[PDB]
Write a protein that binds this ligand. Structure first.
Ligand SMILES: CCCCC[C@H](CC(=O)NO)C(=O)N[C@H](C(=O)N1CCC[C@H]1CO)C(C)C
Ligand SMILES: [Co+2]
Length: 163
């Protein structure tokens, strides 16, 4: 099913999402609907709160060389925790919950996270570049944070301007 994406300035997006404890058919149904919604919206990631589900789960699917997203490359990341973070990097981001606005955000250049997949299997993943940025963007959503919150004095005025 295609789900409605929640947009700024909805206070729903400030929710702190809750850990997933039951890795069952309902979770898989929710993840499938998130994937459908993310692809239909031409995103490369999506956090559950963006479709109104305050659960600590997110998906990421970066496109290949043919510029398309293959479902087999999708990461389903549940109850993630940062283990290591390193360096800094600027990246120009937009967000499905803040549509039409793009700005450079300072992110960690490299991260390592631990999380569970849809079968409750524990994973450790190291990431850099776009994958690291996507991980950080989506985890921020689980904590009620939007990328616009991370902008400077100046770049925030540019946000209010384009608003
Ligand atoms: C880059 C880190 C965040 C990526 C995830 C977001 C989707 C989102 O809001 N998830 O919470 C996205 O797909 N954003 C796209 C985006 O910002 N992109 C797509 C490729 C790289 C970057 C633009 O530099 C826009 C165009 C919809
Ligand atoms: Co977003």
């Amino acid at each position: 099913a295609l789900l409605e994406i929640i947009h700024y300035p909805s206070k729903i997006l400030r929710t702190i999402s809750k850990e997933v404890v039951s890795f069952d058919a309902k979770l898989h149904q929710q993840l499938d609907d998130m994937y459908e919604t993310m692809i239909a919206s031409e995103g490369i990631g999506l956090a559950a709160i963006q479709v109104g589900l305050p659960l600590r789960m997110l998906i990421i699917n970066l496109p290949q060389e043919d510029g398309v997203q293959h479902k087999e490359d999708c990461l389903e990341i549940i109850n993630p925790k940062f283990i290591e973070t390193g360096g800094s990097m600027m990246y120009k981001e937009g967000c499905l919950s803040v549509p039409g606005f793009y700005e450079e955000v300072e992110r960690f250049e490299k991260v390592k996270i631990e999380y569970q997949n849809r079968f409750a299997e524990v994973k450790v993943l190291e990431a850099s570049e776009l994958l690291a940025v996507a991980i950080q963007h989506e985890i921020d959503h689980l904590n009620g944070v939007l990328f616009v919150d991370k902008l400077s004095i100046l770049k925030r005025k540019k946000f209010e301007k384009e608003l």
